[PDB]
Structures are given as C-alpha cells and as structure tokens.
A paper describes a structure:
Protein stability can be fine‐tuned by modifying different structural features such as hydrogen‐bond networks, salt bridges, hydrophobic cores, or disulfide bridges. Among these, stabilization by salt bridges is a major challenge in protein design and engineering since their stabilizing effects show a high dependence on the structural environment in the protein, and therefore are difficult to predict and model. In this work, we explore the effects on structure and stability of an introduced salt bridge cluster in the context of three different de novo TIM barrels. The results show that despite the similarities in protein fold, the salt bridge clusters differently influence the structural and stability properties of the de novo TIM barrel variants depending on the structural background where they are introduced.
The salt bridge variants exhibit similar thermostability in comparison with their parental designs but important differences in the conformational stability at 25°C can be observed such as a highly stabilizing effect for two of the proteins but a destabilizing effect to the third. Analysis of the formed geometries of the salt bridge cluster in the crystal structures show either highly ordered salt bridge clusters or only single salt bridges. Rosetta modeling of the salt bridge clusters results in a good prediction of the tendency on stability changes but not the geometries observed in the three‐dimensional structures.
Author numbering: 4 to 45, 51 to 92, 98 to 185
Write the structure that this text describes.
Amino acid sequence: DEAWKQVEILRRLGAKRIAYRSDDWRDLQEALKKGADILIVDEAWKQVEILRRLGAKEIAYRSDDWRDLQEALKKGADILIVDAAWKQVEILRRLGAKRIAYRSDDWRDLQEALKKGADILIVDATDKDEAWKQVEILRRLGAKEIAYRSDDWRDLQEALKKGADILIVDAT
C-alpha cells in the first residue's frame, strides 16, 4: 500500500541505491522524494513522461513489446528491463537505451548478459535462499550493479548483506 515507508527504513539502514516499482506515478513520485533513486514504471509511457517532467533522472521501463520500449525511451526512460536472452542487449542498445537491466533466475545467464553490456543484473529466483546464492556468486565474480526485488524490506536488507547493490522495493 504505502511502500515508500520501506524506502525510508532501508535508507536509514545504509542502502545507497534504492529502486521503487509501482504502477502509480504519484506513488512513484512520492518515493523519489523519500530517497528512491530509480523509479520502475511497470499506455504506461504517460507515466515516464510525467515523472520525467517532474525532475526524475532515473526512470526504468519494462515490457515485452519493443515498440513499447522504444516509446518509453522517447518519453524519457533511462533504463530498459529485459526479462529472460542475453543476445538482445546489444540489439537493445541500438534502439537508444542508455542503460540496460537484465532479469534472470540463473547466474550464468546474468553473467552472459553482463558480458554483452548489461548494466544492471536483477536476480529473480523462486526460492529466497537460491536468490541469495546467485547474488553471492555474481558478487564473487565482480558483477557491478546487482539488483534484488522484494516487498519485504528485511529480505532486501539481507540481500544488501549478501552483495546486492540495488534494492528494488516492490510496491503493491
């Protein structure tokens, strides 16, 4: 409901890179004011446009349609989220994407996406302990910008302790 409160807690607990995912631009705008650094917009380009006009400098957009991804970029979206092959990261950069986030449940897949120029590696595995291990594996390999998502700030805090650089607060 009011998830921006989770951003405050993680801020005070030493989270330097916090993202906020929501389908309400006002909910997203309020999160930016509470310390959120990345606004993930889940017809949704009207949101990235508003947040862009409201001074947001790190808007992410996810979608399976590339005409949709392309429209989001034109409206201001700085980050584009690919959900798992890694062979489309370079293809996506040609569309004009300044930053590419790659979501996958396997660390090998994420490392492959990192070699192709992916800037952000989102760990999204079924189990929580299995997700922890993938963060740990990527951290050991030196992967920069490891991201983990959860609607429980305690899991996010644990993620940060395991090696996650970006904590995605999932608002709902």
